[PDB]
Design a protein around this ligand. Sequence first.
Ligand code: MG
Ligand code: MG
Lengths: 453, 453
Amino acid sequence: GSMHWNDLLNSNRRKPRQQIERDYDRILFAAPTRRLADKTQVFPLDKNDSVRTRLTHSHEVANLSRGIGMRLAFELEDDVFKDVSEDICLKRDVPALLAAIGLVHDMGNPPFGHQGEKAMSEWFTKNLPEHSDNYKDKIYGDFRHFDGNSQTLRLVTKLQGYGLNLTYATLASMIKYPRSSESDSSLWKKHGFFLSEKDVVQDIWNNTGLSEGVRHPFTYIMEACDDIAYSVLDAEDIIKKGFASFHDLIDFIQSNQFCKEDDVAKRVIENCKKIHADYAQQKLSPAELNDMSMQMFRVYAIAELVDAVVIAFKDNINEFLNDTCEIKDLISCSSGKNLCQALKKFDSSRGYQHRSVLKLELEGSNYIKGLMDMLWLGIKGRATGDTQYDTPFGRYVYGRISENYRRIFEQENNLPACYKEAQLLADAISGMTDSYLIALHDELRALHQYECR
Amino acid sequence: SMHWNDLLNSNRRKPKRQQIERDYDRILFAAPTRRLADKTQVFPLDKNDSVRTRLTHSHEVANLSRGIGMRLAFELEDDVFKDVSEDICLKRDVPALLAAIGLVHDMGNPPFGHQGEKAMSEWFTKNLPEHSDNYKDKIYGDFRHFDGNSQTLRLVTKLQGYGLNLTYATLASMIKYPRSSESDSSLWKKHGFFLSEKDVVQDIWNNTGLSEGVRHPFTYIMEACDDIAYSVLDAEDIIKKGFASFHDLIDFIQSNQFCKEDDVAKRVIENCKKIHADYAQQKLSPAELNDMSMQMFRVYAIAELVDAVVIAFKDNINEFLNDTCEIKDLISCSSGKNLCQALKKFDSSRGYQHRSVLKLELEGSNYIKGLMDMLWLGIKGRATGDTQYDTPFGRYVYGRISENYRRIFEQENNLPACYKEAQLLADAISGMTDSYLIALHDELRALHQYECR
Ligand SMILES: [Mg+2]
Ligand SMILES: [Mg+2]
């Protein structure tokens, strides 16, 4: 069985310019997209150094995906789009679809970078014990292993009961891991949607020809663009902040075990050496020379990695279009896997373990866990029938939660009451920016003095 | 007349996908583009509000321009683009070109909104007297009537002899007002480039078939998209911040003298009234109902204004391609001019004159003028020869200026010394963000205590 591009590019919407272009416009004009500007990506955003935030990273991923779609729809059309209905305009739909899924991919991630997800998962693991009878079911893993992709899908499908009313193609491409926490798929080790979205994704799977464990072909492209953006622009930011030099990056790539014989890595290194041989002649500050060489390396590396990803996607298009697809990621099957791995290693060694990043992660973990404690004081028991929340502090912290999250929490559905409370807490925490989370944590800590003692 | 072959010149100024797409890619990854996220657009940046910044406004304008380009290249190609070489791929160039010029249109604008430009102009008028023999030429008007478009062109052309190396089509499109301060024309009341770029612009005009007073056709589209974004999105921000309600906007449009018996305004009003009546049934908080109604109004108004702009551009394409074009703006020749004027009046009455915006403007003016005084203390005389600047405070404030601006200032050219010093100050002030400008102002004020008295 092979999936068809007519179903994968379904322009219909769940609620009973091209449609996909309108989807991209709605995603861009959405409030969470603008809120992404205040969410930390890797490095602290308080510093005035033009460091990457979630919004800038999302826009870069969207641009890379749009360029890949441009190449796919204009150059390699007959190679990958073999059987497409005439009413579908690939040149207008594919770039727009890739740009939209790139822009929206990190919309539901919690603040404070990766430490946000890690802290939420740790708090949920501690406060929703797996041995306890209330939180024994695997569905609560949705919070014990909380992931931003499921929250993003929930945000785009249930927050407004259809949300932004994205097309089926967009929603299908949003699902990064086609399985839930209840599922036991060996191919994917992470859940891609919550239990509350279990019906919705099913509807998507009923309109795009997809099923559990089967990924949309454009999801691979979006993930590859995300990985490329991470690996390249994190290194660029590392050099920009002065945590390392361009020569340090070149030496790290050259001395990497898998990049000594890698053709792409050697080509990039040679081109960067040639350019740096000319950039040093002009009178430039060491920071200025580092920035120039870093920009040139970014251009070369992004071009090479994007070309390798496009080639890999074109070569493995038949495997992607088949339901029995075992490809993990597009980078791993491409010729640029070694360079991307080396860049990720460099980013981990030089940027992710720097003093500033570690301090930011520690502060984010502290803030998130404290705020989750104070909010759980007012959330727990609301749906299970208990009354322990009915305190002035509990009422206040419940009133501080955004009204849409509370409205979804006070609804009739098959979700267990404990699951509803945990989902309310997760929705409240995930949608917060760094500054808003810190301010709310400080205010609640100030107001909690009597009840805490 | 003018041919599209020259207007869409993909050649780059520096002597030696698509080139024009590469222009948008380079603009997106530029550091000042990321710095735009820290510059206020109209309203101050809060910790919770999703008000537009310069970056979000630029992205919205770019999206609108890209949609216009898709409509022009995919539907109205025969009506708009006649006698175009088969080498030029309109479907890939026109949308990319419009998006690139929309994203870059506000790169060089000073911080603190429009008050930034106003404060820079007032300070330059006071400290560069027109009666003083040192400053009598019209060239110093470049600073007495400082404009963000000229600084944007300067940044893209002379900041990295070439900067981003944008194509000739892009550079021609970013010239909003095709005239200089020295040249006096009744067509345009503002200068579009500095004296230092006179040779660059003359080059661009040579490679695009344009001339003084003749504006690139896509500049009209970019300006129309900028105006539409300004009006509609500022109204949306006003509603979101709570300064006015959706019913207030509806009443203002209905009670507007020109918007009466206006087809576009009536259509938008009726559609929004029906949608609001439908929405009122759902139990939502007043803020939520206002947000939903304003979002639907934004969708309807943006669609109507964009369609009117497209129709006006298509109808007047022959005049736009003529060197004797007398059109001042695309909106005024469209059917949506009345709605745009009413929206601008509503924004001025409720948003721009709100106490928060007035306080932001006053603080920005104070900060900008104080910092300009303290920087002029260390800049003045560096090029004329007089050595009042050679003080520890002057040396420090000169060292705090960005190295690239200082390097351009120290270059030997035909610019007068006073012009070079004023341009150094303008480049320093314009490139700062709000927070960085405030921090530098506080630092210098702390360090200026002894030398002040
Ligand atoms: Mg990402
Ligand atoms: Mg603008």
